[PDB]
Amino acid sequence: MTGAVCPGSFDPVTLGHLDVFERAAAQFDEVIVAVLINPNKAGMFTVDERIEMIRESTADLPNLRVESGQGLLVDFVRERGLNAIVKGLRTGTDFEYELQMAQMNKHIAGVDTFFVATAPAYSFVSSSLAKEVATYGGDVSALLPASVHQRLLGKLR
Amino acid sequence: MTGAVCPGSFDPVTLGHLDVFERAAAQFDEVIVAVLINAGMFTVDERIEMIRESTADLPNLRVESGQGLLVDFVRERGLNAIVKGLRTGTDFEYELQMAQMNKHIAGVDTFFVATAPAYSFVSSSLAKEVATYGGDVSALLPASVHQRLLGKLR
Amino acid sequence: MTGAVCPGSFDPVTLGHLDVFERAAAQFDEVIVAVLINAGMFTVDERIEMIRESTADLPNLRVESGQGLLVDFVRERGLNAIVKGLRTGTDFEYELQMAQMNKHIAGVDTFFVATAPAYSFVSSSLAKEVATYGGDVSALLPASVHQRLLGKLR
Amino acid sequence: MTGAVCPGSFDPVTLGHLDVFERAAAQFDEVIVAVLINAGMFTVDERIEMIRESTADLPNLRVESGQGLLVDFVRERGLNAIVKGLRTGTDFEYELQMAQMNKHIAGVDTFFVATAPAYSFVSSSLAKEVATYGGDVSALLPASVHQRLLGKLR
Amino acid sequence: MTGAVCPGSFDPVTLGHLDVFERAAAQFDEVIVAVLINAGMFTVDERIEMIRESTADLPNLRVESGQGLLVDFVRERGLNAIVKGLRTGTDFEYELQMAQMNKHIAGVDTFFVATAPAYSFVSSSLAKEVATYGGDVSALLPASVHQRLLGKLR
Amino acid sequence: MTGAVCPGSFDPVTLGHLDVFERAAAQFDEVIVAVLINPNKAGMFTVDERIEMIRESTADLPNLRVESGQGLLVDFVRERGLNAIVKGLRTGTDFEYELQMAQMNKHIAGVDTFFVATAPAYSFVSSSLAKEVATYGGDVSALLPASVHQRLLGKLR
Ligand SMILES: CC(C)(COP(=O)(O)O)[C@@H](O)C(=O)NCCC(=O)NCCS
Numbered sequence: 001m002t003g004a005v006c007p008g009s010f011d012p013v014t015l016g017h018l019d020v021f022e023r024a025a026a027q028f029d030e031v032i033v034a035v036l037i038n039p040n041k042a043g044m045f046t047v048d049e050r051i052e053m054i055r056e057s058t059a060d061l062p063n064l065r066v067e068s069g070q071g072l073l074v075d076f077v078r079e080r081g082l083n084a085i086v087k088g089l090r091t092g093t094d095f096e097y098e099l100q101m102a103q104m105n106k107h108i109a110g111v112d113t114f115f116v117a118t119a120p121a122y123s124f125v126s127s128s129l130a131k132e133v134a135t136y137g138g139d140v141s142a143l144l145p146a147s148v149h150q151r152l153l154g155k156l157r
Numbered sequence: 158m159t160g161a162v163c164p165g166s167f168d169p170v171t172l173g174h175l176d177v178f179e180r181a182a183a184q185f186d187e188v189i190v191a192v193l194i195n196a197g198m199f200t201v202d203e204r205i206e207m208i209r210e211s212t213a214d215l216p217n218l219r220v221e222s223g224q225g226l227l228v229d230f231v232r233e234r235g236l237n238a239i240v241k242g243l244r245t246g247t248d249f250e251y252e253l254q255m256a257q258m259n260k261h262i263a264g265v266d267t268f269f270v271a272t273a274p275a276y277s278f279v280s281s282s283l284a285k286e287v288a289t290y291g292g293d294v295s296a297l298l299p300a301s302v303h304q305r306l307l308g309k310l311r
Numbered sequence: 312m313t314g315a316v317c318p319g320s321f322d323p324v325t326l327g328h329l330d331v332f333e334r335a336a337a338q339f340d341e342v343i344v345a346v347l348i349n350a351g352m353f354t355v356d357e358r359i360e361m362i363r364e365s366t367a368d369l370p371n372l373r374v375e376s377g378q379g380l381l382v383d384f385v386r387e388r389g390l391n392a393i394v395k396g397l398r399t400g401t402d403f404e405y406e407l408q409m410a411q412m413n414k415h416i417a418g419v420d421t422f423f424v425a426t427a428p429a430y431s432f433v434s435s436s437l438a439k440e441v442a443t444y445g446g447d448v449s450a451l452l453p454a455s456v457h458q459r460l461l462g463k464l465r
Numbered sequence: 466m467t468g469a470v471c472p473g474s475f476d477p478v479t480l481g482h483l484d485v486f487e488r489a490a491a492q493f494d495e496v497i498v499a500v501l502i503n504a505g506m507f508t509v510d511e512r513i514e515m516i517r518e519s520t521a522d523l524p525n526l527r528v529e530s531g532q533g534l535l536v537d538f539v540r541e542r543g544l545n546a547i548v549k550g551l552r553t554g555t556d557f558e559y560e561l562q563m564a565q566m567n568k569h570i571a572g573v574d575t576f577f578v579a580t581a582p583a584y585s586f587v588s589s590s591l592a593k594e595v596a597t598y599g600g601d602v603s604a605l606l607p608a609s610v611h612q613r614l615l616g617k618l619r
Numbered sequence: 620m621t622g623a624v625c626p627g628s629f630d631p632v633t634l635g636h637l638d639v640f641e642r643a644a645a646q647f648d649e650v651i652v653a654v655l656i657n658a659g660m661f662t663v664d665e666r667i668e669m670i671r672e673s674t675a676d677l678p679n680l681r682v683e684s685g686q687g688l689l690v691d692f693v694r695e696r697g698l699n700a701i702v703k704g705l706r707t708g709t710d711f712e713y714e715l716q717m718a719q720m721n722k723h724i725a726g727v728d729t730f731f732v733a734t735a736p737a738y739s740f741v742s743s744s745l746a747k748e749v750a751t752y753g754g755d756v757s758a759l760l761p762a763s764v765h766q767r768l769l770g771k772l773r
Numbered sequence: 774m775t776g777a778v779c780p781g782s783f784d785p786v787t788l789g790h791l792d793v794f795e796r797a798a799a800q801f802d803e804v805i806v807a808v809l810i811n812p813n814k815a816g817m818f819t820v821d822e823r824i825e826m827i828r829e830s831t832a833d834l835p836n837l838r839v840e841s842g843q844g845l846l847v848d849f850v851r852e853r854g855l856n857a858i859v860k861g862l863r864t865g866t867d868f869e870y871e872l873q874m875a876q877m878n879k880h881i882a883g884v885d886t887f888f889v890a891t892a893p894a895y896s897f898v899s900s901s902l903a904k905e906v907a908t909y910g911g912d913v914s915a916l917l918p919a920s921v922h923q924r925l926l927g928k929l930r
């Protein structure tokens with residue numbers, strides 16, 4: 001009954017995210033990846049595409065499932081009877097903002113946030129920077145799971 | 158005749174902001190909360206009311222709106238000190254950059270003070286965002302602002 | 312079945328550490344508080360006793376002394392996770408370096424959690440230094456500790 | 466033979482950027498200032514002209530426009546190093562992320578240099594914003610720029 | 620009757636420190652530089668002289684030595700405000716931790732102010748270290764301190 | 774005539790240091806590694822040992838040489854007619870102190886400091902942390918050059 005939610009926009013999911021999912025999956029009895037959607041801001045990928053990319057890359061994790069949602073993250077967490085958020089840290093993370101949100105989320109809902117640093121190899125990739133580099137021809141193939149690289153280049157072209 | 162100006166957009170004013178207002182009022186003879194317009198969720202006119210309502214008990218504090226440079230606002234009132242609050246998530250490096258620029262162009266000092274731990278994670282933006290999605294931020298805002306923020310959404 | 316190790320010198324344990332312990336105990340099936348030693352104010356056994364009393368209502372947390380590599384203490388108890396608290400003044404860059412080292416050499420993960428705002432400025436060293444010079448740090452330490460501390464200053 | 470690229474939007478160039486240019490020009494055989502574009506206050510050619518005039522006494526520095534990946538602009542000119550300045554408010558974490566990305570995808574190194582204290586609080590954006598509202602930022606910009614800037618506010 | 624205390628070891632006092640002294644004196648009615656002993660390179664008695672010499676032109680500033688808690692020093696003089704300077708290399712996270720502790724145990728506010736860019740990289744330790752190895756730090760220390768620091772080495 | 778000094782105690786040299794040496798060597802016409810010695814603080818390795826470990830690991834760099842020194846770094850730099858310092862950045866670097874020293878060094882001697890981040894793989898090793906981990910049996914072999922690992926274990930035993 002131990003469990004955590006891993007939230008984000010995942011547009012697209014990166015190997016930095018995957019690294020965090022795997023560590024969460026190894027340490028909690030269940031993990032729910034929360035694909036949080038802004039209903040007014042279209043991303044590069046649809047919810048279906050975002051969810052499929054994550055599923056294809058997490059198939060070896062039997063205790064991880066993927067769901068989309070919107071609104072307050074702590075409502076998503078508590079609706080599933082959970083009380084924990086696992087958030088990844090990378091180079092360029094706005095950690096001070098993450099801390100402010102962690103304190104806010106604990107205050108309004110009693111939900112705890114656990115931060116874990118992604119591996120050095122995956123520490124400089126982010127969804128936005130990966131899309132930017134790929135838009136101008138840069139090779140980001142080593143920084144994204146296989147379910148993503150193709151689809152990304154397709155969107156761009 | 159010491160004095161300081163406490164600037165911000167106060168959209169709306171939080172308990173973090175009030176805490177800073179209070180400390181400034183207890184350490185300077187005269188304090189002027191500067192509501193620098195730039196709309197937002199509130200009109201300038203009602204940002205001011207909410208601050209005045211939450212600070213009616215501070216005799217030596219008063220609230221005005223401003224436009225243009227903050228340093229002109231401060232100096233056209235014969236002062237040269239700014240008091241800014243620090244919370245979790247404050248972009249303090251940008252604050253330092255503005256502090257040095259402001260001292261350079263006008264000789265105005267900036268004093269930073271940490272807000273109380275209890276209000277260290279509330280910010281105007283975050284409180285609005287949580288309150289829109291239906292979370293309770295009543296412990297983080299003055300009662301003057303709370304019932305008013307709700308009525309401006311619901 | 313899940314578990315984490317909460318390591319530290321806990322000289323003495325603070326309410327900040329206890330906050331972390333409680334959150335780990337609430338999430339993981341098993342928590343082990345590892346009292347890793349170096350010279351301090353309290354002996355290992357004194358530190359352990361103080362933690363045990365502070366965590367009396369946490370049935371799934373136990374306290375042990377440790378020596379050697381932290382990752383050895385962790386993997387020898389069949390676990391693979393460390394939970395470390397964050398406060399004002401923590402030195403997070405060093406923590407990150409240690410977390411990446413510990414992952415590299417042993418596959419052990421480190422999860423960080425921010426202690427509550429009320430407990431975010433107490434550290435063992437600062438509480439001792441304040442108590443030393445006659446400051447009241449009772450509200451920052453568990454009741455068990457405050458007596459045993461002041462009773463060691465004499 | 467040695468060389469570096471100094472990239473940026475330089476809208477407009479500041480004395481902070483010029484400090485960096487001079488230090489790069491003093492160390493490397495060849496420096497190329499890359500004016501990488503996006504909408505701003507000055508056109509690319511206007512930016513380039515302003516940099517050329519500011520760097521008139523640097524015979525081994527030239528200025529070119531760029532589009533596409535920065536690392537492409539660098540490796541196409543036969544170089545493999547970027548020199549970036551640091552000031553108060555820089556966002557060094559983002560710079561580090563970009564530096565590690567640029568090394569990963571192209572083998573290009575990034576060297577960072579702190580601008581001199583006198584020039585450490587000016588940024589293009591802040592100087593424009595201050596000038597906009599009638600602040601004197603003449604001492605923070607090259608003489609060539611101060612005129613062309615104020616002559617654009619009108 | 621406003622007032623603030625400016626604490627430190629001042630071993631020796633730098634131009635960074637003086638800059639803060641001056642700003643505090645221009646914004647509070649009364650200022651007390653607190654030289655908190657803990658020896659070092661100087662005796663407390665001569666740390667005080669060097670400060671008094673460099674601040675003879677500040678009428679509303681005076682210098683005393685203290686021991687024990689800084690908050691007792693401040694409050695046993697009927698004040699409740701501390702003014703601390705910020706430079707490049709200030710451990711500001713520890714400063715924040717002390718600021719919150721000090722507010723908690725005694726209700727004393729801490730105001731931080733950035734020192735002028737020109738003195739932003741001098742610190743007592745670093746100036747001593749450079750001056751021992753024979754580098755010129757005369758532009759970073761008051762002339763009262765300079766000739767005196769030399770004579771205490773050579 | 775372009776040149777830089779790479780300073781440190783190098784007790785022992787790490788792969789993080791080596792990474793920085795290589796980048797400095799690639800970008801400047803000459804590099805001098807300055808092994809700065811505190812004459813009152815003995816380290817784990819003698820100056821000879823520190824210098825040999827660096828030399829054995831930098832043999833493929835024809836424009837790099839190694840020298841020891843003490844006192845002011847800027848005197849070391851300027852005595853060799855150079856005007857540049859290249860300093861590596863890693864996880865845990867006291868960057869604010871490095872900046873203070875950079876500004877101080879520019880002020881008193883006109884010497885410029887260029888900072889470069891070591892590769893992610895070598896970003897969490899430091900001389901002190903490597904000695905500590907090795908003291909308690911931890912495997913740091915992947916984080917140090919071959920000229921170091923043996924000698925280190927020898928010192929410890
Ligand atoms: C109003 C504010 C303090 C920002 O406050 P905020 O962080 O609450 O939004 C800042 O934008 C400001 O000073 N505006 C006035 C224009 C100005 O002075 N610009 C020069 C800054 S150095």
Ligand SMILES: CC(C)(COP(=O)(O)O)[C@@H](O)C(=O)NCCC(=O)NCCS
Nearest residue numbers: 318319320347379380381382409412413
């Ligand atoms: C005990 C501690 C966790 C630090 O605890 P502390 O910050 O509370 O004093 C750390 O020093 C430690 O891990 N000691 C065990 C030796 C070790 O594992 N060294 C390798 C660190 S990567």
Ligand SMILES: CC(C)(COP(=O)(O)O)[C@@H](O)C(=O)NCCC(=O)NCCS
Nearest residue numbers: 472473474501533534535536563566567
């Ligand atoms: C132009 C710049 C250096 C930023 O410059 P700026 O901070 O002065 O605006 C950066 O945006 C850039 O590199 N643009 C080129 C596109 C690119 O290379 N993206 C990959 C970055 S890892």
Ligand SMILES: CC(C)(COP(=O)(O)O)[C@@H](O)C(=O)NCCC(=O)NCCS
Nearest residue numbers: 626627628655687688689690717720721
């Ligand atoms: C003297 C000082 C301000 C440190 O100043 P420094 O940074 O110049 O060395 C600090 O050590 C201090 O406050 N000493 C008095 C003892 C005390 O008050 N301890 C509790 C701090 S919360």
